[PDB]
Design an enzyme around this catalytic site. Structure first.
Site, PDB file in Angstrom:
ATOM      1  N   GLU A  32      21.645 -47.881  49.629  1.00  0.00           N
ATOM      2  CA  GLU A  32      21.355 -46.465  49.448  1.00  0.00           C
ATOM      3  C   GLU A  32      21.784 -45.988  48.068  1.00  0.00           C
ATOM      4  O   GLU A  32      21.088 -45.180  47.439  1.00  0.00           O
ATOM      5  CB  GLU A  32      22.044 -45.634  50.523  1.00  0.00           C
ATOM      6  CG  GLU A  32      21.626 -45.987  51.945  1.00  0.00           C
ATOM      7  CD  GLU A  32      20.136 -46.002  52.134  1.00  0.00           C
ATOM      8  OE1 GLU A  32      19.407 -45.262  51.413  1.00  0.00           O
ATOM      9  OE2 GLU A  32      19.668 -46.758  53.019  1.00  0.00           O
ATOM     10  N   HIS A  42      19.135 -46.622  45.595  1.00  0.00           N
ATOM     11  CA  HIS A  42      18.076 -45.633  45.639  1.00  0.00           C
ATOM     12  C   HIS A  42      18.493 -44.383  44.865  1.00  0.00           C
ATOM     13  O   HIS A  42      17.699 -43.803  44.114  1.00  0.00           O
ATOM     14  CB  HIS A  42      17.733 -45.246  47.071  1.00  0.00           C
ATOM     15  CG  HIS A  42      16.950 -46.262  47.845  1.00  0.00           C
ATOM     16  ND1 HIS A  42      15.891 -46.967  47.313  1.00  0.00           N
ATOM     17  CD2 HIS A  42      16.991 -46.583  49.163  1.00  0.00           C
ATOM     18  CE1 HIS A  42      15.355 -47.727  48.263  1.00  0.00           C
ATOM     19  NE2 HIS A  42      15.999 -47.504  49.391  1.00  0.00           N
TER      20      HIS A  42
HETATM   21  C1  CAC Z   1      17.582 -48.786  54.683  1.00  0.00           C
HETATM   22 AS1  CAC Z   1      16.364 -47.528  53.772  1.00  0.00          AS
HETATM   23  C2  CAC Z   1      15.549 -46.333  55.079  1.00  0.00           C
HETATM   24  O1  CAC Z   1      17.304 -46.678  52.555  1.00  0.00           O
HETATM   25  O2  CAC Z   1      15.126 -48.307  53.003  1.00  0.00           O
HETATM   26 ZN    ZN Z   2      15.640 -48.590  51.042  1.00  0.00          ZN
END
Ligand code: CAC
Ligand code: ZN
Ligand code: CA
Ligand code: CA
Ligand code: CA
Length: 360
Positions: free
Chosen positions: A165, A168
């Site tokens: 995360e 991301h």
């Molecule tokens: C584990 As995910 C929903 O951040 O791709």
């Molecule tokens: Zn992810």
């Protein structure tokens, strides 16, 4: 005889191609999402760790203070340096120097289906918009991600997801806030990089992703590397993305250092990848052909050259499943392994983007 058949189109939105004829304890209320209905709702949480780079907010009463502290320390000591050194840094829209980790029972349909959400990051939180928490925050599940016994939840099961995360989050910072284009990375490669960070954190391959690859019917019949199957077999995309970014890691002369270059490249995703290939792999190799070589490498795993993973044992259990009938069309960067024991001629009426590559 066997053939890797690939659609070399690199436009993820491209057409189907024809293959040819035959203070601690402070309180704060956060918006969370009921994933059964996609409705926003409100979750009040308690501050349980306030460290150098992370605040751990807890909204699951089965989680102890020590467990929350363990999560916070893991982030401060291991996750944050890993991600900042190899991927990027977070935004700071709330001007506080830290990120929020909201540890709670993510609401989903696990009880009915056995599928659960482990965690996620939502870029709306970085903006003044409906549902936003106006902060760097990512959401981490307790039950069942930490186990199915609420009296003995194992918080260390979520640690690699912390890296996933946070990747991301810092990817979004670079591409949405620090670059003129303000265009996200293509999801298939953003997810790839999250999974690369998990492997780096664990110092071990993601064997469950490889197991899924090995048993996936959709992959065997041409699942696309770059078109993200949101409504269908999304787990197949996770597996393909993971294997691709590990292939690039092994083919690149600077290995894991290529990850941050991809994020910080000012071009779009395919430009960033093409630049990385030219600078670190081969200056005359196109992205399209590199992706075909990837598919061949999954089959042959040659201990040197483009048709393998440089002999890295992490990937020796990958086994592409052959098929006996090629689908009539393949999506962009969808590929199959075709085997026949009869004489075979490549169809002359295949679409130009379809490549046939004899393996053995
Ligand atoms: C584990 As995910 C929903 O951040 O791709
Ligand atoms: Zn992810
Ligand atoms: Ca912040
Ligand atoms: Ca849950
Ligand atoms: Ca970029």
């Amino acid at each position: 005889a066997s053939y890797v058949v690939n659609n070399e189109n690199i436009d993820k939105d491209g057409r189907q191609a024809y293959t040819g004829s035959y203070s601690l304890n402070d309180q704060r209320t956060f918006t969370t999402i009921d994933n059964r209905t996609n409705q926003d709702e409100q979750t009040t949480a308690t501050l349980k760790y306030d460290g150098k780079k992370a605040q751990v907010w807890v909204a699951d009463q089965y989680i102890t203070d020590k467990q929350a502290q363990n999560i916070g320390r893991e982030f401060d000591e291991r996750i944050d340096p890993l991600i900042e050194n190899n991927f990027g840094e977070p935004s700071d829209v709330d001007n506080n120097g830290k990120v929020n980790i909201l540890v709670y029972d993510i609401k989903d349909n696990y009880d009915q289906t056995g599928t659960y959400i482990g965690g996620y990051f939502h870029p709306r939180d970085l903006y003044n918009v409906r549902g936003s928490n106006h902060s760097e925050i990512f959401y981490m599940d307790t039950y069942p991600s930490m186990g199915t016994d609420r009296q003995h939840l194992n918080e260390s099961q979520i640690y690699s997801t912390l890296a996933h995360e946070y990747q991301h989050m810092v990817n979004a910072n670079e591409n949405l806030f620090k670059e003129q284009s303000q265009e996200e990375m293509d999801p298939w490669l953003n997810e790839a990089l999250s999974m690369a960070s998990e492997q780096m954190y664990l110092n071990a391959p993601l064997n469950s992703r490889i197991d899924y690859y090995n048993n996936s019917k959709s992959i065997a019949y041409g699942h696309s590397l770059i078109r993200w199957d949101e409504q269908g077999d999304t787990l197949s995309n996770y597996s393909l993305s993971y294997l691709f970014i590990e292939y690039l890691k092994k083919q690149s002369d600077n290995g894991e250092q290529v990850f941050k270059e991809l994020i910080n490249d000012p071009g779009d995703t395919n430009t960033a990848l093409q630049n990385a290939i030219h600078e670190h792999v081969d200056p005359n190799l196109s992205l399209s052909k590199f992706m075909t070589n990837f598919r061949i490498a999954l089959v042959k795993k040659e201990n040197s050259g483009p048709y393998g993973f440089k002999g890295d044992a992490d990937f020796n259990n990958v086994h592409p499943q052959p098929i006996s009938q090629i689908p009539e069309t393949l999506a962009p960067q969808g590929s199959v392994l075709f085997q026949t024991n009869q004489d075979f001629n490549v169809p002359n009426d295949k679409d130009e983007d379809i490549s046939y590559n004899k393996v053995n």
